[PDB]
Design a protein around this ligand. Structure first.
Ligand SMILES: CCCCOc1ccc(OCCCN2CCOCC2)cc1
Ligand SMILES: CCCCOc1ccc(OCCCN2CCOCC2)cc1
Lengths: 153, 153
């Protein structure tokens, strides 16, 4: 991934988001509800120190779990670390409407986040252009009804 | 689906094909290996009377089954019936290289077939343009290694 947001202000991505679409390099990363990168973003909480707390939902052991992770800042404003060593990259955002991001170790999953439970064609067009560059083999998108449900059921 | 091949010659789609990509209106139609429209085309055998015999593979009861169905001709050369009542529509083909088709009852799944175990960017570009018109929520594509495996494992 060689697309990062120039001039990202991480404080301005705070608040409510919706995983409108997801894509990944390998089908098994997104195919089942319990697939390991099938994660439904709920909220972004950037720290004063410029780390990024992420609230999301994930299907585990036949139910919709609440999850929290902290993505630690790097010297690049648009790149963050989750290690156990995995990177979060912010590709593009207008803060008000949409945010595109990828998670990578090579394995890769990207999402189109939106602020509201609505299908944003413009945001989906920007997400498809960013994926043109990448070796994706699965792509999912959700309707407004699913966006208001736990784990997009 | 309002895209059909003008002037289809069904005899000329005979022989070997590869399901390079699939898409569907609903995620559950393609998400698991055992998902009901996860079908891997092997061969098309048009009859002299202009019906279309289809050999494909499908994952069922934890294994890769061989399957045969006959799609019966209609008054429209590009449209065929499988009833239990479901339509097969040929969108576009050059006979030599690629064939795009959709199956519909509304539920909808479309494939990009190719003649060889190779990623045909041109064919994938034509498949993405045909899907622009349609309400797809899942899309899959396979690498050359998977295309040579039973059930694309
Ligand atoms: C704008 C930033 C959005 C990033 O949102 C997420 C990034 C990574 C996530 O990871 C969820 C779990 C994936 N990893 C599996 C391995 O252990 C660490 C977590 C979840 C949301
Ligand atoms: C150019 C024509 C290619 C069409 O290929 C197929 C069309 C339909 C298929 O259906 C497989 C099973 C789907 N139906 C489920 C309900 O019962 C009838 C079959 C398989 C290949």
């Amino acid at each position: 991934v060689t697309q990062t947001m120039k001039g990202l202000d991480i404080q301005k991505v705070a608040g409510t988001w919706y995983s409108l679409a997801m894509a990944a390099s390998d089908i098994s990363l997104l195919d089942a509800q319990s697939a390991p990168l099938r994660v439904y973003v709920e909220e972004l909480k950037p720290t004063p120190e410029g780390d990024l707390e992420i609230l999301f939902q994930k299907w585990e052991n036949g139910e919709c779990a609440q999850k929290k992770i902290i993505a630690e800042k790097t010297k690049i404003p648009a790149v963050f670390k989750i290690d156990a060593e995995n990177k979060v990259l912010v590709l593009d955002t207008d803060y008000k409407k949409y945010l595109l991001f990828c998670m990578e170790n090579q394995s890769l999953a990207c999402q189109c986040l939106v602020r509201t439970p609505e299908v944003d064609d413009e945001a989906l067009e920007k997400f498809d252009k960013a994926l043109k560059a990448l070796p994706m083999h699965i792509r999912l998108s959700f309707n407004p009804t699913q966006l208001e449900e736990q784990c997009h059921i």
